[PDB]
Amino acid sequence: SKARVYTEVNVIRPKDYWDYESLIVQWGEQDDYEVVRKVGRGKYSEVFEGINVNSKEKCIIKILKPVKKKKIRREIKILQNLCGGPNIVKLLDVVRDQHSKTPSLIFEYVNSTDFKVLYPTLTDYDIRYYIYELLKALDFCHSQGIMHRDVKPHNVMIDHELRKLRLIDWGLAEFYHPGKEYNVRVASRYFKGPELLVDLQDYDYSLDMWSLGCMFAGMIFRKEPFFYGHDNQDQLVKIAKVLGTDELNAYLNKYQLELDPQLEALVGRHSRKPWSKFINADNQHLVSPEAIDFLDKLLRYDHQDRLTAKEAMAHAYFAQVRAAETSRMRSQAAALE
Length: 337
Ligand SMILES: O=P(O)(O)O[C@H]1[C@H](OP(=O)(O)O)[C@@H](OP(=O)(O)O)[C@H](OP(=O)(O)O)[C@@H](OP(=O)(O)O)[C@H]1OP(=O)(O)O
Ligand SMILES: [Cl-]
Ligand SMILES: [Cl-]
Ligand code: NA
Ligand code: NA
Ligand code: NA
Ligand code: NA
Prior knowledge:
Phosphorylase Kinase, domain 1; Transferase(Phosphotransferase), domain 1; 3-stranded antiparallel beta sheet; binds inositol hexakisphosphate; binds chloride ion; EC 2.7.11.1; signal; protein serine kinase activity
């Protein structure tokens, strides 16, 4: 298997671009940034709100807990390659405790609510807008040869007042090289794609589109998580109880995969359920025909058959969002002129 798009990015660009393990980190002055208060509760790192000592502009400080030195360089290299991209969190500096070399990542300040806490309050239209803005980030990083591999509500930070969205936490992100077999121990359980659950290791950018589909389903159907598995095996069961096992078997047969008998026993056999099954009077206002067609084209076993980020942005579901952005920019230009 090879990606349908952006296949050759890392063949066109030089070794220095994707060879993170050889990264030369020009660290900054740790003294330039002062921590203010803790925030994050994670096992990979600790997050603090901070300030630049001089400019006094706020910032986010992410101290990377003990991890393979290679995981530190991977996250920094990816953040550097994506720096400046649409809706990518902006890495401003990297410093380290100059006696233990414990790295800290300095990001732009993110005055945001978490997607998980925000979307229950959002209108149909604002869900389209923020999904669209998230697609902009994913198309950009895919176009730069990078898979995020941990798309989920916690990693989407939104300042709803300013309508700004940022895709954060690039600690699991990886460079896409065609033909390469990757570790499947990525993404969070509820957002893991079937490829991870059946051990299809030569996956690609389309993994992120499955995860986006899971988020989207949970939002428009007001069911969080949409696929609520109790472990990685049950996660595939929960998917198969919606998408059906015929399409699963066709997918396994196409990529010459076999499930362990223990897992096949749990999956059993299940009919495909129509997306309308999840519509109720309480989520009806979020589930248009266009939403279902869009969702149906994301949540497919076959990663090759899912929409790319670019194709997703072009779906009719975002027709009004696209018209708003076209109009906004044309007006901004005239105001400047
Ligand atoms: O089988 P192990 O002895 O545990 O080695 C593995 C394995 O490396 P090999 O391919 O050399 O067997 C993983 O490689 P991939 O599955 O990614 O090809 C690698 O994956 P990551 O480095 O991406 O995590 C993983 O690393 P981790 O230590 O995080 O499990 C690493 O383990 P070691 O570095 O300890 O050998
Ligand atoms: Cl999933
Ligand atoms: Cl894709
Ligand atoms: Na900021
Ligand atoms: Na925030
Ligand atoms: Na797949
Ligand atoms: Na309703």
